[PDB]
Amino acid sequence: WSWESYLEEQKAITAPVSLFQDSQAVTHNKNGFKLGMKLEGIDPQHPSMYFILTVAEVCGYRLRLHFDGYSECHDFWVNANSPDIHPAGWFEKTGHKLQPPKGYKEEEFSWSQYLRSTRAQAAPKHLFVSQSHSPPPLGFQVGMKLEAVARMNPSLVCVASVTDVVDSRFLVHFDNWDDTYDYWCDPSSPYIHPVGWCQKQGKPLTPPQDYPDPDNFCWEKYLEETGASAVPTWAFKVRPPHSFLVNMKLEAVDRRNPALIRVASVEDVEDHRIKIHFDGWSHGYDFWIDADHPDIHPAGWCSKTGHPLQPPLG
């Protein structure tokens, strides 16, 4: 099974490499991670928290991460060029807090001792794209407020704060709302707006949870109450809409079993998101995803990275 013949057969076209951020397209970097190596990384489900992680599996340019001491049903995949993982000792040097592996207390964890008691190695520093050596995102500092879209199913534009900054990105948090809604962005995200955007758009702004007298939430009053400043307008450099067109083919990670990447097709589009359909499967599986999501790639990504591509259901 090659893409050449599948295109010839379906009389289809692939989404050009130029439509992808090149972190989604780069295939020539070597994956240096090895089974057993230990490191630090955020919990996808709680992006504001850091844990000790172990490389559970290596496949192509990807790897499965395991929360030391916890159940294997929490393992998740990332690409080797993921900005959400860091080398051992990162949190300490960056002043971040670490959630100790199951069984330890924050006051009894030292990499030195830990590696020795587990007879393991820390993944070398030269594998991580993110280890705080980069220039912070311009104009976005911890404590600043803004309006951002929360994937609350359905989505809402809520009052939010920058609660963490790492290298070139920041973490958006929704005031007094559940932690799990946080997400890392950069200044060009299409989901963030400056304080006051909603009012100027004539849209409803969702105030903090249980904020007294929600109906009359007032940004100026709130910034006064918190002493927080608003992310300055100039800092927002929203990116242009993507140019993926319907029917273009590409490769996407199966979110029913992320260990697998299938042949995919653009089913529909919006300004910043595309709808994935896995060739040969029901449409019940279609799903929307941001155009810059790290789990979609140009055709041939698997082959070039040594990862198995699942052909359309035959």
From Swiss-Prot:
Gene Ontology CC annotations of this record: chromatin; chromatin lock complex; condensed chromosome; nucleoplasm; nucleus
Site (Positioned at the entrance of MBT 2 and is required for recognition of monomethylated and dimethylated peptides): 153
Effect of residue 254 to N: Does not affect binding to monomethylated and dimethylated peptides
Subcellular location(s) per record: Nucleus
MBT-type repeats, residues: 1-101, 109-208, 217-312
This protein's UniProt keywords: Chromatin regulator, Metal-binding, Nucleus, Phosphoprotein, Repeat, Repressor, Transcription, Transcription regulation, Ubl conjugation, Zinc, Zinc-finger
Post-translational modification comment from the UniProt entry: Ubiquitinated in a VCP/p97-dependent way following DNA damage, leading to its removal from DNA damage sites, promoting accessibility of H4K20me2 mark for DNA repair protein TP53BP1, which is then recruited to DNA damage sites.
Tissue distribution of the protein: Widely expressed. Expression is reduced in colorectal cancer cell line SW480 and promyelocytic leukemia cell line HL-60.
Other remarks on this protein: The L3MBTL1 locus is imprinted. Paternal inherited gene is expressed, while the maternal inherited gene is silenced.
Name recorded for this polypeptide: Lethal(3)malignant brain tumor-like protein 1
Primary gene name: L3MBTL1
